[model samples]
Target chain A: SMAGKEIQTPDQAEAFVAKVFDVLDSYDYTRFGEVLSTDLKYEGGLQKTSGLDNFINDIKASTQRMPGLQTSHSRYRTELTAEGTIYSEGHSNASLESNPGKVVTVPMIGVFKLDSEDGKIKEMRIYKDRLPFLALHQALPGMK
Target chain B: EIQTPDQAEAFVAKVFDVLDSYDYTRFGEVLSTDLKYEGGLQKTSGLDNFINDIKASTQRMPGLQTSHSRYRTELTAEGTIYSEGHSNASLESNPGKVVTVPMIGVFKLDSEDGKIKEMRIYKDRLPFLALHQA
Candidate 1:
């Protein structure tokens, strides 16, 4: 018996990814872990983390480092490819508390591979240039 | 005949090989004459124009070379192919520096000939640019 529904079709894949995005945008770490496999592998830019708790804690640390940080995706297109893989192309916008007036938008691509047995996200790869985000943090008064 | 998933994967690998070869002339072998290319900062039409753009870039950075460190090629249900990966390259301007950039490429193949008709690439250029400044 599987805990989650199998994401086999395009519609199912889209819904799954959309739900993941929704959870992330709201910073709901508890629900976020629920949607991912316990042995989740996440790679974004130069950062890599494994396991559900590590991924959640890593994101929480990021928010703590940049207080009031908000991020959302826009202009995204999703396609279900192969057996259980979803590919998404979009732009991510991030705003930090230190620079409330400035929002950095960067092109991003996300690849999510769901486990065949349980349809939970086992691996997620995020591709985006992190230089702008890094520059933004460096510009902060005490961040330097 | 519709392109199979395996064929799509091979097609993407060939495309990357052509890019790695830096042979501007052979680009037409993999791309359609009326190719549409969209990069992060620039968009161009026609295979000739795309080749010329690549040529110009190669001329500017003679030592530049691009290779995928990790990549996955998946054929969508709609027949389009999505290839995403981390690309590592050495910048001629930076001399000794190598930069890794995450890239996503969408490729649509021509039905009649299987040549790539449209190519959309999304990636951050900041890391590459930062190398030059440093």
Candidate 2:
């Protein structure tokens, strides 16, 4: 039912972004491909990808590195800009495979820019403090 | 009046410039009288208190300067301006040690005037803390 949703209003933008998050969390590449533009550009804490397939591959590679890696969000907030860009803020609890039973909570923010005509996300940027995660792995500055 | 995205972007750039200058007096001009500031772990209310806290923080790290690598500013439909960026700053205590921090900020401009009234900042403090304590 959320298919082909165009982000024109605030509510619509929120719904579209929620759908994107759901698809990403589930690793539903088919649905994910449906939500992103072919010329997508994704930038995050660890990597940047240009194009849809590259982005998808990056996600898959990350999961391979940290098998069973799972993330949950808390205190989530989302808002729509005047230009229809979406800003999402939350804290993410990520379980590390390197250290079982250890979870790192980091503050995260995502900015999504959608193509006006098609409503597919054209660019996505994510910002987060990677210090905690690095420290958890003993990879802090001068430790590696 | 910071009603448009361009204005908001410019205003934020100016704010950063002022902050880099460490000129609390000039920085006060951009903030409203009833300013509220929320950092990752600290919350400060009132304009004077916030200024004093910033001064103290700067004093702790002399010759500290913050520069953003990448940033985007957007004005929300409700008039709140949001800025998200990655920044790095060197600490005086750990000379030449640059700590990179990612930050998200929300600024609400006063209705009567364009000065920033409410400001919320979300950032990773671990790098800064680890370096300062090292």
Candidate 3:
């Protein structure tokens, strides 16, 4: 339930992210729960992953192979503009188990489709270059 | 009025302005009262919820702020707000350490009425955590 921070209180939000980061670091996703609505959907270009259970299992399976996987946000800034919109950008770097010295650095921009109440993220569109990471994934079978 | 390929970019800037200010309270005046927000994930039938939702999310992460970096309205035909940007999200527990996530999507809106009709959000979620293998 720690993942409940998708759109909860700022403290819950941070905790949600921290748990995700922790999962990435230790490959433990037991903390994955409720951060997002049970109906949360994830868009990954070719396919969008849906359901919290599916999302949690997906993360666990992918990170299991890349034991050395480490992801960190170098920077991010979000500003809500007029007409009820938020403009945001961020960068994340990851170290793959296959490539010990090599780290995959990814940059992304997201537009949050926000829902009030508990502040659950309803829709989010992300823009980034995942082709490089995709190419790297071709070399590894177990890393998702 | 600036030397750029697009002129209707101010609205884009203004959206970020309102977000940076955390002024959801004034959504009724800014957004079309009868707006419909549709997307691949969350869908809403009104405008007030649209503004309140983002505002509430911002309240959750006080450190993860944003700014408008680029806007492209140069192309015609598909004359809508197509944006690409990022932000530093301050993880509550992580304190100072922030995580950067990608955000890319297109928005269909009503300029005269000031409301978003539909939005599509696409991103690459680090699947490691979900797979329990990271």
Candidate 4:
């Protein structure tokens, strides 16, 4: 029954995860912010933040810094089945520049928390090479 | 001898380090021009063509920025050097601000010559296409 109905393979899981990002790119969010579970939690970067608006706003801010930011999966592994909850990881390519125009592409890893229903990512904790970017960033954001 | 996981792990890491650095000038020092990526996504043939094709792909999608964050591999150094590694590519996206593309790859190296003969990359291209938000 769950053969092609749910995430049958790592490929499908990864694709659906990417679709979330696609929506962020192609659509003006506010309209869909609510679509994301309000209890969404993103654990990565300097802090672990929560809530709906804050989460979407965070993406907006990052986009401001690296307007041409792009992410490619350097590696992905899955230990999931179609019938049960899924867990997988991916190494990300972070090739972005600082305000002064220096370019470097650092790598990162992501731990995904998938919802029991429909497989949307409920929470994500991403591990990245922070020093390279942090050392250059003149400032960091404050708690909200 | 050097046919162990410990050695292979370090070797693979070093390889990606070079790739991350985009030592395009020295890529030939590590890879075979008769390069063939016959795994998933797009494949390449010939050293010059491999380089040019990669450049072309990057050109077609100007916003796609990539590099391996953590590369893990398994290798056996016998008559042939066979290695498989996992890599991720974080891209420069338009609508989707930050997108991470994932890939798994198996590589065949010319042990004596130290050049990549064939590379089979298995990755999720959907995320790359997903960033084509419009």
Best by lDDT: 1
| RMSD to native, candidate 1 | 14.8
Q: How does chain A of every candidate compare to the true chain A by TM-score?
A: 0.85, 0.80, 0.64, 0.61
Give residue A60's error in model 4 in angstroms.
3.1
lDDT of each: 0.72, 0.70, 0.50, 0.56
lDDT of 4 by residue, B1-134 (tens): 24666675565566666665556788887788788866465667887876776677667776554444334455654523344444434344342344454455566777567677776766666665545554
Q: Candidate 2, residues B26-120: lDDT per residue as tens digits?
A: 86789887899898777888988888888888777675655442246899999999987655555444432445566788999988878889999
Looking at model 4, give its docking quality level: incorrect
List, residue by residue over A1-144, the lDDT tens digit for candidate 3: 332324434444444344444554343455343335566676756656677677667767666654545455433455554444444555555544444234445666655544454545455455677666654544346665
Q: Give the Cα error of residue B12 in candidate 4, in Å.
A: 3.9
Model 1 agreement with the true structure over A43-144: per-residue lDDT tens digits: 997889999989989999987777767566543467887665788876665655454334455678889887776777899998998767765655356664
Question: lDDT of candidate 2 vs native?
Answer: 0.70
Residues B1-134, model 1: lDDT tens digits: 43576777677767877776776789889899999999877778999889888878878766565655224678888889887766655544443244556788899988888889999988888877755543
Indicate the worst ten consecutive residues by lDDT in candidate 4 chain B: B87-96
Docking class of 3: incorrect
Each prediction's fraction of true contacts recovered: 0.00, 0.00, 0.11, 0.28
Candidate 2 falls in which docking quality class? Answer: incorrect
Q: Please give, for every candidate in the order listed, the TM-score of chain B alone compared with the true chain B.
A: 0.86, 0.87, 0.60, 0.73
DockQ each: 0.02, 0.02, 0.06, 0.22
List TM-scores for all candidates, in order: 0.48, 0.46, 0.40, 0.56
Every model's Cα RMSD, please? 14.8, 14.1, 17.7, 6.7
For model 2, name the residue pairs that clash: none
lDDT of 1 at B47: 91
Residue B99 alpha-carbon offset, candidate 3, angstroms: 9.6
Once fitted onto the true fold, the runs of candidate 2 whose alpha carbons sit more than 4 angstroms away are: A1-5, A97-100, A135-144, B1-134
